[PDB]
Design a protein around this ligand. Structure first.
Ligand SMILES: CN(C)c1nc2ccccc2n1-c1nc(N2CCOCC2)c2nc(CN3CCC(C(C)(C)O)CC3)n(C)c2n1
Length: 840
């Protein structure tokens, strides 16, 4: 290859954080096959993208303006402040006017046609034929009561986005030779056997075990395990799952490879150890630590191509379909869906149940299933249902044709909605049997098609590549595919970002292992901090970089005087940058907190579900005033977090008035709000914001089953906006403490106008969510699988069914939630006080 060609690939590696030309852990060529296979989709999308629009990446939505944002326009007139040449002028614009038309009524109001409208201080643009009201930035301004400020400048040059050119009827059987681990303690004596499963979509087709034996550094069987199922009957994407029990180790092996070939030969598989069920148990990858890991040795020696329902049965069938996603299917249930297959096809909500009713261990039956998909008319014409689509992409479906129809239905998503679900789609890639998938190809295209999506795709993929041995190989290949298509402008941006984040990660760890647990910091700890940051500033760190959680904002130089270390346990950095954009309205800095560590992946998963819950309320015209702060995971137990300005912790508001207890005063919160309000009109508005945002997080947390939290984890702004934080960690349903209630004008057993408004808001919010029950359930279950440790599929998930009061009616549901509120009144400060004792 060329001298430049190798330096480029070395640049890719630095961005990816994994070398995809490095073949150290693989038993086949699938990863290299997939690199080639992604070239066409990549190239297809680069070719179809408009250079101008790709360069300006307008952030837009086809959804209608909510009632709460219509009420903020009372004259049918929106005001845009344009800035040019040190002179600024307000202008009256109609909500239906396009950017090109308002620019028209600009040059008119004077008494050359190549200027674009950019937001001041941000990398946002208003352009294309869209109504100004359909621009996100505009809607964001109307919601927070912000004036819309826009500067007139030159469109960014599409030249900068340029892309470099490309250069048997036999029963299946497996011999278990044995298992070898380099070392073991002595011991104590225990017993070990091997369990071989044939798995397709977590359904077990066949199972065979070995005879238990004494656990020693090498254990031999050399026995053939003959299964019932025939070689010809193996479905594509079926896993041979090998597990050792005493459950200690597991490893997976794809039985049919990426070329449709049956797997054959000797295999020495290095397995994964269980930590003293989860998407990591599905992985076809083998443990990269080849020296210290348990391994299993097996042998494979053994090609594909190439009447109306009666009424009472119809009701049982419909009852099946009505149930939630995670309700289990009996055998009779399954046989009903399968026999009545043609009826089931007329009910898009039955697709997940019907496809779990397929016997995938039988080739004739799989064959029928494909014929069934052949007439897709009803599925193709149906309204897009995201939660339904999401069910076909989870761990219960390994068939590429089933999964592909889900992806077909994704194709109709506007960028706005792809952002909403991006994180969850990226995680779903883990459930893909093969590295090259319709879903993987769909993430590629959407990312290549739009810079905002592309930006987040990059960080989502990079997070997993950095902390996951299970999926990093497959993600790294998809990221490389993305990077070769995004343009050199974006390659440059990413390169600037990565250099900064890694340097600051180095520092984050270097301070953390200069410090202990308060006690505590410490002038010395803060001196070493500034010292290290001084060495980076000069020299050398990048002049500027995009903020990974807010790609609109460009960060400038550190402000080293305001940087510091946080008094907490984990000793996170508090960093502040100047904004690099000189057209920015204010002088405010950009705060960022670097933390090691909790798991910031759990925070990302929750914040995303939180933004989903918001959009659900937006369709019903509800505004619960949530605050999903930017949070990105960088590496194992490490990442960045957006600093929310003028915000404090509820705990810190109690210890200002009181000290290092623990003795919680009811009036404190309300005094803090009043003290922090410049006028009384802003304090009333703040009490209003706190009623909605409190109602918002009570309902949201109760459903996600995270409702029981310490006051250190809750925050509030000076404008009254309450928000939960740190999601990577007697009882209570959620947190409504006497101090929250006091702000609502309630001391226990007393109702008030603000507290009645609260209950009313909670119920409306809660009942709106219940209409989305399937969606929330699938999202929730996916989060557990992809984001938490090994959990119980059966009991942990079940919480949210109770939380969402499945099967009940809006009357019982309204009662149920109201009771929960009462439970919080009766507990008062008791759970809170106990949390304080558990961290003392
Ligand atoms: C462990 N802590 C640091 C933490 N983990 C988090 C995980 C996810 C999200 C947030 C997490 N925080 C977190 N995130 C804070 N963010 C500031 C407001 O946006 C959001 C970020 C935060 N803030 C305080 C208290 N805080 C009081 C005011 C102080 C100052 C006067 C300089 O403004 C500065 C220090 N704690 C204890 C905080 N923990």
């Amino acid at each position: 290859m060329s001298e430049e060609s190798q330096a480029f690939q070395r640049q890719l590696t630095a961005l990816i954080g994994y070398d995809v030309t490095d073949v150290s852990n693989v038993h086949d060529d699938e990863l290299e096959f997939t690199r080639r296979g992604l070239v066409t989709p990549r190239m297809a999308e680069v070719a179809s993208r408009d250079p101008k629009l790709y360069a300006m990446h307008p952030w837009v939505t086809s959804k209608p303006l909510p009632e709460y944002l219509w009420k903020k326009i009372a004259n049918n007139c929106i005001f845009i402040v344009i800035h040019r040449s040190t002179t600024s002028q307000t202008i009256k614009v109609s909500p239906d006017d396009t950017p090109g038309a308002i620019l028209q009524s600009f040059f008119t109001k004077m008494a050359e046609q190549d200027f674009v409208l950019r937001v001041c201080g941000r990398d946002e643009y208003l352009v294309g034929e869209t109504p100004i009201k359909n621009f996100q930035w505009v809607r964001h301004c109307l919601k927070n009561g912000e004036e819309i400020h826009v500067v007139l400048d030159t469109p960014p040059d599409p030249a900068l986005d340029e892309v470099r050119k490309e250069e048997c009827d036999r029963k299946f059987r497996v011999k278990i030779r044995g298992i070898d681990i380099p070392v073991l303690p002595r011991n104590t004596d225990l017993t070990v056997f091997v369990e071989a499963n044939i798995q397709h979509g977590q359904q077990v087709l066949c199972q065979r075990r070995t005879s238990p034996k004494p656990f020693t550094e090498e254990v031999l069987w050399n026995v053939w395990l003959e299964f019932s199922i025939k070689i010809k009957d193996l479905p594509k994407g079926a896993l041979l799952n090998l597990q050792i029990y005493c459950l200690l180790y597991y490893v997976n092996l794809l039985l049919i490879d990426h070329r449709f070939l049956l797997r054959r030969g000797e295999y020495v598989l290095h397995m994964w150890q269980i930590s003293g069920f989860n998407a990591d148990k599905l992985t076809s990858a083998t443990n990269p630590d080849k020296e210290n890991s348990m391994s299993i040795s097996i042998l494979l020696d053994n090609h594909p191509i190439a009447a109306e329902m009666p009424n009472q049965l119809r009701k049982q069938l419909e009852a099946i379909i009505a149930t939630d996603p995670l309700n289990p299917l009996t055998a009779e249930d399954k046989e009903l869906l399968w026999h009545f297959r043609y009826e089931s096809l007329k009910h898009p909500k039955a697709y997940p149940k019907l496809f779990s009713s397929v016997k995938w261990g039988q080739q004739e039956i799989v064959a029928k299933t494909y014929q069934l998909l052949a007439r897709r008319e009803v599925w193709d014409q149906s309204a897009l249902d995201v939660g339904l689509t999401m069910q076909l992409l989870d761990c219960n479906f390994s068939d590429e044709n089933v999964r592909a129809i889900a992806v077909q239905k994704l194709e109709s998503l506007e960028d706005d909605d792809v952002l909403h679900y991006l994180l969850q789609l990226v995680q779903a890639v883990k459930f893909e049997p093969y590295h090259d998938s319709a879903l993987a190809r769909f993430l590629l295209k959407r990312g290549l098609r739009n810079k905002r999506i592309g930006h987040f795709l990059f960080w989502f993929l990079r997070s997993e590549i950095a902390q996951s041995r299970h999926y990093q190989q497959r993600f790294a290949v998809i990221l490389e595919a993305y990077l070769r298509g995004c343009g050199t402008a974006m390659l440059h941006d990413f390169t600037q970002q990565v250099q900064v984040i890694e340097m600051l990660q180095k520092v984050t760890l270097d301070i953390k292992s200069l410090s202990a647990e308060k006690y505590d910091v410490s002038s010395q700890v803060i001196s070493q901090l500034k010292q290290k940051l001084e060495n980076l500033q000069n020299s050398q760190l990048p002049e500027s970089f995009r903020v990974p959680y807010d790609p609109g904002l460009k960060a400038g130089a550190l402000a080293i005087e305001k940087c510091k270390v946080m008094a907490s346990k984990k000793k996170p950095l508090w960093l502040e940058f100047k904004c690099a954009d000189p057209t920015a309205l204010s002088n405010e800095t950009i705060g960022i907190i670097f933390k090691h560590g909790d798991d910031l992946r759990q925070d990302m998963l929750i914040l995303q579900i939180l933004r989903i819950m918001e959009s659900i309320w937006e369709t019903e015209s509800l505004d619960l005033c949530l605050l999903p702060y930017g949070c990105i995971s960088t590496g194992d137990k490490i990442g960045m977090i957006e600093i929310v300005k003028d915000a404090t912790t509820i705990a810190k508001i109690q210890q200002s008035t009181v000290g290092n207890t623990g003795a919680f005063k009811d009036e404190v919160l309300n005094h803090w709000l009043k003290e922090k309000s410049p006028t009384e009109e802003k304090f009333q508005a703040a009490v209003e914001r706190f009623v909605y945002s409190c109602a918002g997080y009570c309902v949201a947390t109760f459903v996600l089953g995270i409702g029981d939290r310490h006051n250190d984890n809750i925050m509030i702004t000076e404008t009254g906006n309450l928000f939960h934080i740190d999601f990577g960690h007697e009882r209570v349903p959620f947190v409504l403490t006497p101090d929250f209630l006091f702000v609502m004008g309630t001391s226990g057993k007393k109702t008030s106008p603000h507290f009645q408004k609260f209950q009313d808001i909670c119920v409306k919010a809660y009942l709106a969510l219940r209409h989305h029950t399937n969606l929330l359930i699938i999202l929730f279950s996916m989060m557990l699988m992809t984001g938490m440790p090994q959990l119980t599929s059966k009991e942990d998930i079940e919480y949210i069914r109770d939380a969402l009061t499945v099967g009940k009616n809006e009357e019982d549901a309204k009662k149920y939630f109201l009771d929960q509120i009462e439970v919080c009144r009766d507990k008062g400060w008791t759970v809170q006080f106990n949390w304080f004792l558990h961290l003392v």
